[PDB]
């Protein structure tokens, strides 16, 4: 029985290596990684890989790994797929822990924009969780944390992390992680998967996919939002992505909004993440 070596980048930046039979479905590898992580609430997470165009793709757990990675390396990342709107409702602290690790990368990467004060507050909760109570011995006037808190670090931001860290004395790691999540969950881009697209007139927009629905970012002044219940049908054809928008009460017909994606693979990828979010957030 021939087995392929798999390398998975974990949310703490470490590498897990395992073997699966070469005809294995994605669920087989996912179950091995989740057992390694002692993760029971697995529904929120998945594995990503990079395709021949270097785009992030979700590994479909129901399909053969080899028919997804195709010509590429069996290299993956472990990631949050469905960001819970209310992390307090997750049953386990270790679930909230991995969600925190993912969000820390969302912030450092700039996928999750954040004000100065919120960067410092989220930072302060991580430090409390990871080091425990503030100690002056470690941090002098010139202290700079090993922890990455932001896309761009300043001495002012390091100072504000320390000031808020002092306020958290006696906070336990689970408590600090829950506070981190209570703040992060409110950010306007929390759990929003962004896709570059053009509208029917050729104007460059972004489509965001999240728990609540589909967002169309146009000007900064004019963001259209479609709650999942108002979305009747999702579809793609060639480079185009289509949504069927419900008639407003006493309207005779559904409405249709069309988008141009960069290529056919980018259109299918957006279709699949929309279908999965629609299903996931219809059952929650
Ligand atoms: C849940 N919220 C955030 C609060 C909000 C809602 C409406 C207007 C301003 N801010 C969304 O942006 C949203 C996403 C997709 C469909 C419907 C609403």
Swiss-Prot record:
GO terms for molecular function: actin binding; cytoskeletal protein-membrane anchor activity; structural constituent of cytoskeleton. Its main location: cytoplasm. Expressed at high levels in brain, with lower levels in kidney, intestine, and testis. Detected in lung. GO terms for cellular component: cell junction; cell-cell junction; ciliary basal body; cilium; cytoskeleton; cytosol; glutamatergic synapse; juxtaparanode region of axon. It is found in: Cytoplasm, Cytoskeleton; Cell junction; Cell membrane; Cytoplasm. Residues 4-284 form the FERM domain. Keywords: Acetylation, Actin-binding, Apoptosis, Cell junction, Cell membrane, Cytoplasm, Cytoskeleton, Membrane, Phosphoprotein, Tumor suppressor. It comes from the Eukaryota. One of its GO terms (biological process) is cortical actin cytoskeleton organization. Tumor suppressor that inhibits cell proliferation and promotes apoptosis. Modulates the activity of protein arginine N-methyltransferases, including PRMT3 and PRMT5. Interacts (via FERM domain) with CADM1. Interacts (via FERM domain) with PRMT3; the interaction is direct and inhibits the protein-arginine N-methyltransferase activity of PRMT3. Interacts with PRMT5. Interacts with PRMT6. This is Band 4.1-like protein 3. It comes from Homo sapiens (Human). The chain holds residues 107 to 390 of 1087 of the full protein.
């Amino acid at each position: 029985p021939k087995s392929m070596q798999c390398k998975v980048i974990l949310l703490d930046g470490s590498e897990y290596t395992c073997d699966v039979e070469k005809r294995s479905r994605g669920q087989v590898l996912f179950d091995k990684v989740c057992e390694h992580l002692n993760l029971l609430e697995k529904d929120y997470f998945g594995l990503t890989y990079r395709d021949a165009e270097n785009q992030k793709n979700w590994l479909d757990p129901a399909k053969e790994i080899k028919k997804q990675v195709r010509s590429g390396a069996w290299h993956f990342s472990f990631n949050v797929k469905f960001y819970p709107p209310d992390p307090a409702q997750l049953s386990e602290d270790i679930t909230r822990y991995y969600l925190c690790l993912q969000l820390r990368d969302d912030i450092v990467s700039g996928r999750l924009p954040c004000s100065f004060v919120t960067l410092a507050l989220l930072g302060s909760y991580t430090v409390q969780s990871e080091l425990g109570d503030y100690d002056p011995d470690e941090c002098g006037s010139d202290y700079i944390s090993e922890f990455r808190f932001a896309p761009n670090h300043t001495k002012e931001l390091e100072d504000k992390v320390i000031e808020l860290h002092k306020s958290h004395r006696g906070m336990t790691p689970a408590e600090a992680e829950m506070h981190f999540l209570e703040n992060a969950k409110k950010l306007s881009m929390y759990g929003v998967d962004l896709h570059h697209a053009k509208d029917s007139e050729g104007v460059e927009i972004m489509l965001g996919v999240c728990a609540s629905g589909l967002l169309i970012y146009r000007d900064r002044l004019r963001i259209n939002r479609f709650a999942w219940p108002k979305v009747l049908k999702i579809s793609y054809k060639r480079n185009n992505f289509y949504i069927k928008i419900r008639p407003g009460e006493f309207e005779q017909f559904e409405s249709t909004i069309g988008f141009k994606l960069p290529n056919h693979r980018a259109a299918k990828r957006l279709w699949k993440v929309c279908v999965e979010h629609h299903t996931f957030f219809r059952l929650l």
